[PDB]
Amino acid sequence: TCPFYKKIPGTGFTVDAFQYGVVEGCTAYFLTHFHSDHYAGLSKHFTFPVYCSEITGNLLKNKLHVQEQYIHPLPLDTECIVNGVKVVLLDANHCPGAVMILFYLPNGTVILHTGDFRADPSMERSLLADQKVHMLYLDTTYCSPEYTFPSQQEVIRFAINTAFEAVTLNPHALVVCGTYSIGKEKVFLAIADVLGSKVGMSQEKYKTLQCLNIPEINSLITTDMCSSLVHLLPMMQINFKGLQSHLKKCGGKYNQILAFRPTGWTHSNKFTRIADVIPQTKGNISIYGIPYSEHSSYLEMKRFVQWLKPQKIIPTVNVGTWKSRSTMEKYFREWKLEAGY
Ligand code: NI
């Protein structure tokens, strides 16, 4: 059964609610983004209306085979009427195709559902500038002050410089990047661009990238691994055993691997600056863990919320323990007393 924080009161709508069978009263199922925890349940047998972005719609059709007749893509930044209710989709600064949803309820209440997001000051100049929000359904993944990490631009600077230095010292080094979902594509695209290479990958991953409306993509990626000196591998293979096994397959073309594992936050963030990051090394294999986040830091979250001044906040992450719920409620009250709303 569908939990309360996935229902939108006063509408026939749900958000990210496909794992509960037929939800009673639901006339339109919104999908914020193509990540498995959120789409859990969709398939070719789905026969209700799905509302989403263009990019999410391309993925539903090609990767999950949802039939065309049930996919409803909406443009961003545009007032749309759905089943008699005005809605707007906004860029969530999460993975490709990810949105926030603004719902203008028939009774005058305005609701913002963030989906998954990485808050940014640019959101203060979207269509959110114009008006009041009564309820915020918030991505609270990192709602505690210990969760710190650098900007995505600093992380990409570190990865480009690390890869360009290594391959210039040794033209016979291969670079490998881990992946397990959409998102974080800048890591492997920026590294391949500095090395003058296409990115090599499986047919399955190529198919997924072909759904993402990335400009000039045909110039950036390929399934011909032999032509490429940046390879993508499943995240599970990014370890000394998996990488040894991969280097054997490359026909003596390479004598060294440099690998990247994009993670979210890890506790080495509590001590080590991005500059000072060092790899794990065995022989001719080195592995860097880099903290490339597609969720708000504590500080980015707090800024957003203090600017928006919502009347009520409903967390959508970390909701399963009393201690997590209590901790998040305390910070919401500080933020409100500090800013005066
Ligand atoms: Ni996500």
Side-chain angles (χ1 to χ4, degrees), residues 1-23 25-203 205-215 217-240 242-247 249-269 271-281 283-311 313-341:
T1 55
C2 192
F4 75 95
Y5 74 79
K6 296 179 179 268
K7 286 180 179 155
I8 303 305
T11 65
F13 303 153
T14 58
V15 180
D16 298 348
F18 300 86
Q19 66 165 299
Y20 310 104
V22 183
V23 179
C26 189
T27 55
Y29 295 75
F30 286 78
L31 184 53
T32 64
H33 70 292
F34 194 78
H35 279 163
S36 59
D37 282 358
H38 295 259
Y39 68 73
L42 270 167
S43 71
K44 69 155 75 163
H45 308 296
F46 203 81
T47 43
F48 300 99
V50 179
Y51 288 82
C52 61
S53 67
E54 172 180 0
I55 290 164
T56 299
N58 296 341
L59 291 158
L60 291 182
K61 176 182 164 188
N62 294 287
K63 298 292 288 194
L64 293 185
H65 307 287
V66 175
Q67 299 171 42
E68 198 128 80
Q69 72 175 148
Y70 305 110
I71 308 170
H72 294 264
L74 306 179
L76 303 185
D77 304 319
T78 299
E79 291 184 331
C80 295
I81 311 299
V82 177
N83 294 0
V85 181
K86 181 163 68 165
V87 305
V88 173
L89 297 189
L90 306 166
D91 208 289
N93 190 43
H94 184 49
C95 62
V99 302
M100 317 191 289
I101 313 160
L102 251 197
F103 299 97
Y104 289 85
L105 264 48
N107 66 10
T109 296
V110 178
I111 292 168
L112 176 66
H113 199 302
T114 66
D116 281 351
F117 86 140
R118 186 162 182 178
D120 194 72
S122 60
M123 297 169 176
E124 301 167 24
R125 293 171 288 281
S126 59
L127 309 199
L128 295 172
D130 303 40
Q131 108 281 280
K132 183 176 186 61
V133 173
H134 302 84
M135 314 209 81
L136 179 62
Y137 287 68
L138 181 60
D139 167 15
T140 43
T141 294
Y142 297 128
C143 188
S144 192
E146 73 273 21
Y147 300 117
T148 63
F149 34 73
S151 67
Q152 292 178 164
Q153 193 279 321
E154 293 172 87
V155 177
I156 290 301
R157 176 88 284 191
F158 173 83
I160 291 166
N161 286 4
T162 300
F164 183 74
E165 168 168 326
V167 171
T168 304
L169 292 168
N170 181 193
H172 303 272
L174 178 63
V175 181
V176 181
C177 292
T179 180
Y180 46 27
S181 58
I182 66 164
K184 313 192 184 185
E185 288 81 9
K186 194 66 171 175
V187 175
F188 56 81
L189 299 167
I191 289 166
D193 168 271
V194 76
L195 303 177
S197 184
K198 304 188 167 182
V199 186
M201 58 196 68
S202 73
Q203 295 185 260
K205 185 73 187 179
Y206 182 89
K207 177 172 187 196
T208 297
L209 297 183
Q210 284 291 156
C211 300
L212 309 182
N213 293 344
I214 291 169
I217 193 61
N218 294 331
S219 70
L220 312 171
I221 61 180
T222 186
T223 51
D224 179 14
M225 311 296 287
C226 289
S227 78
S228 153
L229 61 134
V230 180
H231 298 174
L232 305 190
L233 286 182
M235 198 72 90
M236 293 199 74
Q237 197 159 6
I238 310 302
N239 47 69
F240 298 121
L243 293 164
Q244 281 164 192
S245 173
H246 189 74
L247 185 61
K249 294 162 220 146
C250 294
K253 210 159 180 298
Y254 309 107
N255 59 14
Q256 186 186 343
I257 289 181
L258 177 95
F260 298 90
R261 287 192 329 91
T263 63
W265 170 94
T266 68
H267 185 67
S268 40
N269 275 272
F271 303 126
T272 319
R273 281 183 141 64
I274 186 57
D276 300 323
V277 168
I278 63 160
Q280 278 198 218
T281 299
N284 62 348
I285 309 181
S286 290
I287 307 173
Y288 285 87
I290 61 175
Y292 190 96
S293 185
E294 292 184 339
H295 295 276
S296 314
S297 74
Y298 175 84
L299 289 169
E300 286 163 355
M301 192 191 302
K302 177 175 181 279
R303 178 182 167 124
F304 178 80
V305 173
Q306 287 182 315
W307 170 82
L308 193 69
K309 304 181 172 43
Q311 285 185 358
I313 306 179
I314 301 162
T316 61
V317 185
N318 304 309
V319 303
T321 75
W322 298 112
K323 180 191 196 194
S324 283
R325 290 187 143 299
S326 192
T327 291
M328 288 182 297
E329 287 178 355
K330 275 165 41 257
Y331 287 127
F332 306 152
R333 175 70 64 185
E334 296 176 7
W335 301 350
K336 181 181 160 81
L337 291 169
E338 182 184 26
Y341 56 101

Short mmCIF file of all heavy atoms in Angstrom, two decimals, residues 33-35 38 94-95 116-117 294-295, ligand 1:
data_model
loop_
_atom_site.label_atom_id
_atom_site.label_comp_id
_atom_site.label_asym_id
_atom_site.label_seq_id
_atom_site.Cartn_x
_atom_site.Cartn_y
_atom_site.Cartn_z
N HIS A 33 11.87 10.98 -12.18
CA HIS A 33 13.14 10.63 -12.86
C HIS A 33 13.30 9.15 -13.02
O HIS A 33 12.66 8.38 -12.22
CB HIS A 33 14.34 11.32 -12.15
CG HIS A 33 14.71 10.83 -10.79
ND1 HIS A 33 13.93 10.97 -9.66
CD2 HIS A 33 15.82 10.19 -10.36
CE1 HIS A 33 14.58 10.48 -8.62
NE2 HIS A 33 15.73 10.03 -9.03
N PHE A 34 14.19 8.78 -13.90
CA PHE A 34 14.44 7.30 -14.22
C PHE A 34 15.51 6.70 -13.30
O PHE A 34 16.64 6.36 -13.84
CB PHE A 34 14.77 7.16 -15.73
CG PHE A 34 14.70 5.73 -16.23
CD1 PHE A 34 13.45 5.17 -16.47
CD2 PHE A 34 15.85 4.99 -16.49
CE1 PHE A 34 13.38 3.82 -16.94
CE2 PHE A 34 15.78 3.68 -16.97
CZ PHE A 34 14.58 3.11 -17.22
N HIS A 35 15.28 6.62 -11.98
CA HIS A 35 16.10 5.87 -11.05
C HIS A 35 15.22 4.73 -10.44
O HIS A 35 14.03 4.95 -10.10
CB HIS A 35 16.69 6.71 -9.91
CG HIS A 35 17.95 7.50 -10.26
ND1 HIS A 35 18.46 8.56 -9.54
CD2 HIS A 35 18.79 7.32 -11.31
CE1 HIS A 35 19.60 8.98 -10.11
NE2 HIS A 35 19.79 8.24 -11.19
N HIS A 38 12.54 4.77 -7.73
CA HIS A 38 11.39 5.64 -8.02
C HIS A 38 10.52 5.02 -9.06
O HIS A 38 9.26 5.15 -8.93
CB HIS A 38 11.91 7.05 -8.47
CG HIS A 38 12.63 7.75 -7.39
ND1 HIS A 38 12.09 8.75 -6.62
CD2 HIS A 38 13.88 7.57 -6.89
CE1 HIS A 38 12.92 9.11 -5.68
NE2 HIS A 38 14.03 8.40 -5.82
N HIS A 94 19.45 17.06 -11.00
CA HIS A 94 19.79 15.69 -10.51
C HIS A 94 20.37 14.93 -11.70
O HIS A 94 21.46 15.33 -12.11
CB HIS A 94 18.50 15.07 -9.88
CG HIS A 94 18.64 13.71 -9.22
ND1 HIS A 94 19.61 13.42 -8.33
CD2 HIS A 94 17.97 12.56 -9.46
CE1 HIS A 94 19.46 12.14 -7.92
NE2 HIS A 94 18.48 11.58 -8.61
N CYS A 95 19.76 13.93 -12.25
CA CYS A 95 20.25 13.19 -13.43
C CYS A 95 19.51 13.72 -14.68
O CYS A 95 18.50 14.45 -14.55
CB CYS A 95 20.01 11.66 -13.24
SG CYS A 95 18.26 11.18 -13.05
N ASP A 116 14.04 13.90 -6.52
CA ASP A 116 15.47 14.01 -6.11
C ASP A 116 16.07 15.33 -6.74
O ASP A 116 15.79 15.57 -7.96
CB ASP A 116 16.28 12.80 -6.56
CG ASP A 116 16.12 11.56 -5.67
OD1 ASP A 116 15.51 11.65 -4.59
OD2 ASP A 116 16.63 10.56 -6.11
N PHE A 117 16.81 16.10 -5.99
CA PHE A 117 17.35 17.38 -6.50
C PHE A 117 18.69 17.73 -5.85
O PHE A 117 18.98 17.33 -4.73
CB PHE A 117 16.34 18.56 -6.48
CG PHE A 117 16.19 19.38 -5.17
CD1 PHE A 117 16.05 20.77 -5.18
CD2 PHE A 117 16.15 18.79 -3.89
CE1 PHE A 117 15.84 21.52 -4.03
CE2 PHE A 117 16.03 19.56 -2.73
CZ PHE A 117 15.84 20.91 -2.81
N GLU A 294 24.82 14.25 -6.91
CA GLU A 294 23.59 14.80 -7.57
C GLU A 294 22.40 15.08 -6.58
O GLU A 294 21.24 15.22 -6.95
CB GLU A 294 23.19 14.00 -8.80
CG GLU A 294 24.26 14.17 -9.97
CD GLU A 294 23.86 13.48 -11.28
OE1 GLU A 294 23.00 12.52 -11.31
OE2 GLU A 294 24.48 13.93 -12.32
N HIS A 295 22.78 15.10 -5.28
CA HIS A 295 21.84 15.58 -4.20
C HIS A 295 22.39 16.80 -3.48
O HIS A 295 23.64 17.00 -3.38
CB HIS A 295 21.60 14.47 -3.16
CG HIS A 295 20.90 13.26 -3.65
ND1 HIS A 295 19.53 13.12 -3.75
CD2 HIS A 295 21.40 12.02 -4.03
CE1 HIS A 295 19.21 11.92 -4.22
NE2 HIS A 295 20.34 11.24 -4.38
NI NI B 1 17.59 9.70 -7.88
#
